[PDB]
C-alpha cells in the first residue's frame, strides 16, 4: 500500500521557493545532505555507547556517494540512525515548520539560499537539483520505508520491498535534465573538497 500525504503549507511554500527562485549556487545541496548524514551517524554512535546492541544492524559508520548516468540519479547513502515512519510523516515536518518560517523571514531580510542548513531544513535544498527525491530509510525501532516527493504539495510513504539496508538512509536524487554535472566524478570531488572536507566519517565517491 502507498500512502499519500499533504505537506504542511510552510513546507510546500519552502519547496516552491527552492524550485522557482533564480539561484545559480546549486552545489550546496551536497553539503546539506552530507551534513544530515553526518548528524545521523553522530546519533547512532552516541546511542551505541549506552546500548551496544544498536550496532547489531551494522557496525560500519560511513557515507557513500553513488552517481548513475543511465538512471540520471545521485544517491547519498549513510549508515546513520535512520528514520521511523513517525519521523517521515509527522515529527520532522513539525520541527521543519519553525525552521522554514525563520529561513523565509531571513531571505526577506537579505540572507541567501546557501544559509538553509542554519534553519535545519537543508534536506529540502535537494530540490535545487532534483525533480524527484526518494528517501529509503531503516531505523532500529521500525521497518524499512520509502518516502518520495516530486513536490506539488504531496509526498508518499510505503513499506520498502527493495534491497534490505540493515540501518541508515539512502537519498536518491532524480536529477533535473540540466543538472547532470552532479553525476561527474571531478564535479562531485570538487564539491566534497570545497564544503565537506572535515566530515568525521569516510565519504566514498563511487565511480561508474
Ligand atoms: C533532525 C535533523 C535532521 C533531519 C532533517 C530532515 C528534515 C527536516 C526532513 C528530512 N530530514 C532528514 C533527511 C535525511 Cl536524508 C536524514 C538522514 N540522512 O538520516 C535525516 C533527516 O532528519 C527528511 C524528510 C523526513 C523526508 C523531510 C524533512 O522534513
Curated annotation (Swiss-Prot):
The modification N6-acetyllysine is found at residues 43, 69. Disulfide bonds: none annotated. Changing residue 78 to A: Impaired ATP-binding. Strong interaction with HIF1A, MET, KEAP1 and RHOBTB2. Loss of interaction with HSF1 and ERBB2. Los of interaction with TSC1. ISGylated. S-nitrosylated; negatively regulates the ATPase activity and the activation of eNOS by HSP90AA1. Changing residue 82 to D: Abolishes ATPase activity. Residues 1-208 are annotated as: Interaction with NR3C1. It comes from the Eukaryota. ATP binds at residues 36, 78, 97, 123. It is found in: Nucleus; Cytoplasm; Melanosome; Cell membrane. Homodimer. Identified in NR3C1/GCR steroid receptor-chaperone complexes formed at least by NR3C1, HSP90AA1 and a variety of proteins containing TPR repeats such as FKBP4, FKBP5, PPID, PPP5C or STIP1. Forms a complex containing HSP90AA1, TSC1 and TSC2; TSC1 is required to recruit TCS2 to the complex. The closed form interacts (via the middle domain and TPR repeat-binding motif) with co-chaperone TSC1 (via C-terminus). Interacts with TOM34. Interacts with TERT; the interaction, together with PTGES3, is required for correct assembly and stabilization of the TERT holoenzyme complex. (Microbial infection) Interacts with herpes simplex virus 1 protein US11; this interaction inhibits TBK1-induced interferon production. Belongs to the heat shock protein 90 family. The TPR repeat-binding motif mediates interaction with TPR repeat-containing proteins like the co-chaperone STUB1. Molecular chaperone that promotes the maturation, structural maintenance and proper regulation of specific target proteins involved for instance in cell cycle control and signal transduction. Undergoes a functional cycle that is linked to its ATPase activity which is essential for its chaperone activity. This cycle probably induces conformational changes in the client proteins, thereby causing their activation. Interacts dynamically with various co-chaperones that modulate its substrate recognition, ATPase cycle and chaperone function. (Microbial infection) Seems to interfere with N.meningitidis NadA-mediated invasion of human cells. Decreasing HSP90 levels increases adhesion and entry of E.coli expressing NadA into human Chang cells; increasing its levels leads to decreased adhesion and invasion. This is Heat shock protein HSP 90-alpha. It comes from Homo sapiens (Human). The lineage of its organism: Eukaryota, Metazoa, Chordata, Craniata, Vertebrata. The chain holds residues 16 to 223 of 732 of the full protein.
Amino acid at each position: 500500500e502507498v500512502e499519500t500525504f499533504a505537506f504542511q503549507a510552510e513546507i510546500a511554500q519552502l519547496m516552491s521557493l527552492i524550485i522557482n527562485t533564480f539561484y545559480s549556487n546549486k552545489e550546496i545541496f551536497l553539503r546539506e545532505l552530507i551534513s544530515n548524514s553526518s548528524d545521523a551517524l553522530d546519533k547512532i554512535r552516541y546511542e551505541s555507547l549506552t546500548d551496544p546492541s544498536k550496532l547489531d544492524s551494522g557496525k560500519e559508520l560511513h557515507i557513500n556517494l553513488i552517481p548513475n548516468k543511465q538512471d540520471r540519479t545521485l544517491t547519498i547513502v549513510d549508515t546513520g540512525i535512520g528514520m521511523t515512519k513517525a519521523d517521515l510523516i509527522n515529527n520532522l515536518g513539525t520541527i521543519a515548520k519553525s525552521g522554514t518560517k525563520a529561513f523565509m523571514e531571513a531571505l526577506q531580510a537579505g540572507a541567501d539560499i546557501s544559509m538553509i542548513g542554519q534553519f535545519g531544513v537543508g534536506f529540502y535544498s535537494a530540490y535545487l537539483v532534483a525533480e524527484k527525491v526518494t528517501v529509503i530509510t531503516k531505523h532500529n525501532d521500525d521497518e524499512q520505508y520509502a518516502w518520495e516527493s516530486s513536490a506539488g504539495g504531496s509526498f508518499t510513504v510505503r513499506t520498502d520491498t527493495g534491497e534490505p539496508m540493515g540501518r541508515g538512509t539512502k537519498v536518491i536524487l532524480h536529477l533535473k535534465e540540466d543538472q547532470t554535472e552532479y553525476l561527474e566524478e571531478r564535479r562531485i570531488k570538487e564539491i566534497v573538497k570545497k564544503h565537506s572536507q572535515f566530515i568525521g566519517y569516510p565519504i566514498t565517491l563511487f565511480v561508474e
